Amino acid sequence: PGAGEANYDALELNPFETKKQRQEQEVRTLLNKLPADTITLDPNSIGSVDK
Amino acid sequence: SKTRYYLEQCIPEMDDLVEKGLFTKNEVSLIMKKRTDFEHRLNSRGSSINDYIKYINYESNVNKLRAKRCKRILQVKKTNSLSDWSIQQRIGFIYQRGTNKFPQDLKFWAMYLNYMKARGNQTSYKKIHNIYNQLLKLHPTNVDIW
Amino acid sequence: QYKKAVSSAAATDYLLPESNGYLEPENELEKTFKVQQSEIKSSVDVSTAN
Amino acid sequence: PIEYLLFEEPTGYAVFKVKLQQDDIGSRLKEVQEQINDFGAFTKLIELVSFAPF
Amino acid sequence: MKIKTIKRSADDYVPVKSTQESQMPRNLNPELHPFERAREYTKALNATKLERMFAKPFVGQLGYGHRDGVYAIAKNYGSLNKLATGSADGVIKYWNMS
Amino acid sequence: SSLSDQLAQVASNNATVALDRKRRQKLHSASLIYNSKTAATQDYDFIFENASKALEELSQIEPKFAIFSRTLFSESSISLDRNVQTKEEIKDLDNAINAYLLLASSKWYLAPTLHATEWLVRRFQIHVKNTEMLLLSTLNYYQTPVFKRILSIIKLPPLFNCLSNFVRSEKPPTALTMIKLFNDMDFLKLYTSYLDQCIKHNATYTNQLLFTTCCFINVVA
Amino acid sequence: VRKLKHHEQKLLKKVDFLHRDTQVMRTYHIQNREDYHKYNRICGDIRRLANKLSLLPPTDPFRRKHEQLLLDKLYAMGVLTTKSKISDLENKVTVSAICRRRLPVIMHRLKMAETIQDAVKFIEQGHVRVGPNLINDPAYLVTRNMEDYVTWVDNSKIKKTLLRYRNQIDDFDFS
Amino acid sequence: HTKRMQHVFQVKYSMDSKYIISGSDDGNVRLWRSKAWERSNVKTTREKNKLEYDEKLKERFRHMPEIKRISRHRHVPQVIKKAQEIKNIELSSIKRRE
Amino acid sequence: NKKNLKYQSSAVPFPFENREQYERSLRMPIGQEWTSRASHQELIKPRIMTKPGQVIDPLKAP
């Protein structure tokens, strides 16, 4: 009865995807793929400052 | 998109309406399902005056239900809230959108005028003027309108 | 500014499209783990049963 | 500063209200000339207001 | 034993018409949208790359020019087409930049 | 039982669920009066207003249809969906629709019946969920554009392969083909059950009985 | 993936994880991409043997004997026709030479079948024999002498019809 | 900078703030874009929002080393490059004798 | 877990005065996926905005 999350988010994952939406979104994610070395233990370590 | 803009603009009065004890979460959510259906039908191409009219009719019935609900559940003629004028403001917004999209339909223009005049207690003498100015400019050779 | 942002997120929450589903007893004699997949399929919607 | 325009037609006069102004210096550029051709951008620049038929 | 599950109305998600634009549910749950810093950093980096490949400054020159080098320019502070240029030849011109 | 078979079974179960835009335009484009384009573009409100007018005309013809106006022809009937109801409510729908087809088998020469049944097709997907009843209802009108269109939009249960060969052609099915159909032995049991239902509900008429008896004669012949 | 547009090409010019191989596929009809890669790797193997044997001191009986062994064995395989050179070995041993040594191509130049695809169909249907024994798999490089002794299997419809046209059929041999 | 523009003697910035006019003594009155991107056409609201979002994001991440390297790389004539390194040398000299 | 310099920033960008101002703004995100539409707009509204083809007189008020 309560396993999956009832209300998803279209910008990320559509259970309903017309072929054109799917391919367009594929190119979208391909553009914005994160660099491999961004993977770290704390996903905020990009922001800070040092000199 | 623009539908998202309209829905979020609708949120706060919904917040107020649930906050005051006269609409349950589920009922309000159903109301928003219907709202979203209408919003997409207007925004998407191929829409028609029938869609605008049905949207208006649904909202008017919601307003009536809200009025009777506040009459019954707390026996107050008028809550000093945001909603009580929010629904009619949205109806006016619908009329304006419909007429800016189909300035041809005399029947819709006339529904607009009848609504605004009949609710004329709170409305503007000036607002009737503006509607009539715009209509006359668009259809100068309608002696019926004149 | 941050607080304005999170209040906006909460309003979106009023705007969500659906609702999670649950499973509760109503009672004390019977317990949840005693239900059977046949019982659920009988008691629920045909799209899910399919 | 082009607030309105007048357009004569075989079936009567039309008057349009200019909503935005295309930039005045860039007018000779490929980009603004194309937006004149396209219909989507012309609607953003112009909305009809009046129409008196003959 | 009151139960219910996630039931979707295909009528609600996939519109009956063909022209009608399907709806895009949105959920602003932070755990649903996972990478803020890395995602936005790459959006900004792509943005600067696009800036560099769209920088095209020169837009054009004004007629055939002046014979002998330009030494006076004065824009019209009232209008927007008009400037006035003048050259060491002694010849002054009033340009329509539109 | 190969995985392909098992998935064919599941596709049959989910025949009428529109899981994406393309499948929806198929299921909605299938229609009785309008061609594919206009069918795909129009809406439940339009279809339903036409249905209300048509069924009002039919009720004026004979008073029986009022109950269907009450139960299958309301704005609530605009709202509901086949797929999100439970098994019991599915059976209730099926009983109601079978009763309506039994009534409507008698006036298949009226554009009112054509329009009302068009509503029923387009909203409750009879042309997929229950086609045996529909075909059995309209079988004796087999020389009519209405029946040609029903073949065009239908999916054929395994008994009607003869009509299957005549789908999407231009010439009407012939008496000899109908005689093959009846000459089957299982189909005879099916049609026997249908006549039993018609009799117990006292809803029989000449043309239908003529076609039934002529087919039985030619079967024994 | 989508024939992606100009600007996004410029950002992502190299993101495609999805044509001499195909050219030979069409010109001499070799069987598969892995087949073509096999021939390329064979040629590379030969090249590297040449390089390393050259690195070996040229004034060595071992190196020179092994060179002559290699070149003779290649000649016997019939990929090349000459014997007097080594630069021949480094240059003209080609996927083209191997693929023209391929059996259906041999059938075509020796004129068994009018086309490469008809030749391969005949190999499948089992109508050819090399010396005693017949051949079923086209990717069969035929040695010099053997390709000289290729012909049909006996009592096949193909030979029967050939002889019928010639009016030289002879049923004693049950041709 | 251009190979065909020399001794900029007069500069005037335009009354719509969008363009730059430059009179140069080779006899020419060129005119340039103030921001080298902003095409003059009218932009659909979606595109406009995306562009403003671009600008906000890169103002946010302006000082990250990769983005700074990319958005500061601009090609300059060799005369200006060499003059700049010489001028830097002279300033270092002054500074350390001081 | 030594932090990475290439993705470490360099100096507080302009519109901020202090490192902590900078850090908190980095805590708040802009993109469409993390804020409602209205908040996304008013966060990306640029400081100075001009109408397209009009002339900008200097201000005059007393």
Describe the strand arrangement of the main beta sheet of chain G, using strand numbers.
2-1-3
Task: Name the biggest interface.
Answer: E-H, 41 and 36 residues
The chain-level structural class of chain G is mainly alpha
Number of strand elements of chain F: 0
Beta content of chain G: under 5%
Number of helical runs of chain G? 10
How would you sum up the global shape of chain G? flat
Rg of Cα set of chain F: 18 Å
Let me know the largest β-sheet of chain G.
Answer: 3 strands, antiparallel
User: Which series of helices and strands of chain F comes N to C?
Assistant: HHHHHHHHHHHHHHH
Given the C-alpha coordinates, what overall shape of chain F results? globular
Give the quaternary arrangement of the chains.
part of a larger assembly
Number of strands of chain G: 3
- What distance separates the N and C termini of chain G? 57 Å
> What is the overall number of helices of chain F?
15
User: End-to-end span of chain F in angstroms?
Assistant: 41 Å
Per DSSP, what share of the residues of chain F sits in E-state strands of 2 or more residues? under 5%
User: Which structural class fits the helix and strand makeup of chain F?
Assistant: mainly alpha
Sheet with the most strands of chain F? none
Structure, described:
This is part of a larger assembly, with nine protein chains of seven kinds. With 146 residues, chain B is an all-alpha fold. Chain B contains six helices and no strands. Chain B is globular and about 50 Å long. Chain D is an alpha+beta fold. In chain D, a hairpin with a 2-residue loop joins strand 1 (4-9) and strand 2 (12-18). The longest helix of chain D is centred in the middle third of the chain and has 8 residues, at 30-37. Chain E has 98 residues and is of the alpha+beta class. Chain E has two helices and four strands; from the N terminus they run ααββββ. Chain E has a three-stranded antiparallel beta sheet, with no helix packed on it. The longest helix of chain E is centred in the middle third of the chain and has 18 residues, at 37-54. Chain G has 175 residues and is mostly helical. Chain G has helices at 6-11, 20-27, 33-55, 61-77, 87-91, 95-101, 103-109, 116-125, 144-148, 157-166; strands at residues 128-130, 133-134, 150-152. A three-stranded antiparallel beta sheet of chain G has the order 2-1-3. The longest helix of chain G is centred in the first third of the chain and has 23 residues, at 33-55. Chain G is flat. At the E-H interface, helix 2, strand 1, strand 2 and strand 3 of E face strand 1, strand 2, strand 3, helix 1 and helix 2 of H. Chain I: Involved in nucleolar processing of pre-18S ribosomal RNA. Chain I: This is U3 small nucleolar RNA-associated protein 14.
